[PDB]
Structure formats: structure tokens, C-alpha cells
């Protein structure tokens, strides 16, 4: 082994398919949205705590998340409810927020996009 953690699980072989337009409005709005920002790339994969040499990361993080696994559990619809990806987001979101220092570049980059997601949630469809 190392530092980092095998990577969530991101497919359900044993699960049906099946979309909700809520499903769909998470990966067609907000994944898609927030994965084209400026400010996505550090998100877009599991934090590499051995490339970064973060020694403490996985120690403080208890659940590890970020949009790359959102991403593929979104299109191979791993999730069974909109509810499990809206906590996977706010997972992510925090994971950044107590790890990281208040000033940091990390958590600026952080903001924008809770800011952004949290705008496209207010706007979640029924
Ligand atoms: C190496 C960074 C340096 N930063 S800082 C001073 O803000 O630039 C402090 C954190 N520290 C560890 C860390 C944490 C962390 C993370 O939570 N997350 C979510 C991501 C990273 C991360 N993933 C990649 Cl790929 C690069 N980095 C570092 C960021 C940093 C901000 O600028 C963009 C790149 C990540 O790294």
C-alpha cells in the first residue's frame, strides 16, 4: 500500500439502470458545469497524497471524495437517488474546508465552486 486509499467505488454492476431528471440535472448542469470551470483541476481526481507528499491528508479526511468519481458515478449511474450525489459534493466541499488553511489558494478555488454549485441546487427541479 501507500498514503492514498484505493479510489471509491464508481460502478454498481448489480444495480438497474435508472435515470430521475434530478439525476440528469446533476450530471447535465451542475457536474458539467462545475467540471469546465477554472478552478475545477484540483477537484477533477482523488487528492494524490503520495505525489503531494500530504502525509496528514488521509488521516484528517474520513471519506474521500472528488468530481472525478462523481463524474464517473454519474455516467455509469452508480447512484441509486439525486440525494447520495447532492452528499458526495458536500463531502468533497468539506474534505477541503478542514484540511486545508482559511487563506490558501486551495480553499479559494474551493468557494467558487461551492458557490456555483450551491446556486444550481437552489435551482434543482422537482
Ligand atoms: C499543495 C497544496 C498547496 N496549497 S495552496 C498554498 O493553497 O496552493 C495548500 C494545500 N496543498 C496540499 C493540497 C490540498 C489539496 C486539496 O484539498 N485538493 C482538493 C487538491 C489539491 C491538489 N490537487 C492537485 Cl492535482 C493539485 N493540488 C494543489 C492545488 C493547490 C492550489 O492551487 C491549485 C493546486 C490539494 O493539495
Sequence with gaps: GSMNPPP??????????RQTNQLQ????VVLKTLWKHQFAWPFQQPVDA??????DYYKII??????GTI??????NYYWNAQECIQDFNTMFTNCYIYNK???D???M???LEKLFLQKINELPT
Design 106 to 108: 486551495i480553499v479559494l
Design 8 to 17: 471509491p467505488e464508481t460502478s454498481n454492476p448489480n444495480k438497474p439502470k
Design 50 to 55: 503520495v505525489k503531494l507528499n500530504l502525509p
Design 62 to 67: 474520513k471519506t474521500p471524495m472528488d468530481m
Design 25 to 28: 440535472y446533476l450530471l447535465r
Design 102 to 104: 482559511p487563506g490558501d
Design 110 to 112: 474551493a468557494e467558487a
Design 71 to 76: 463524474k464517473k458515478r454519474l455516467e455509469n
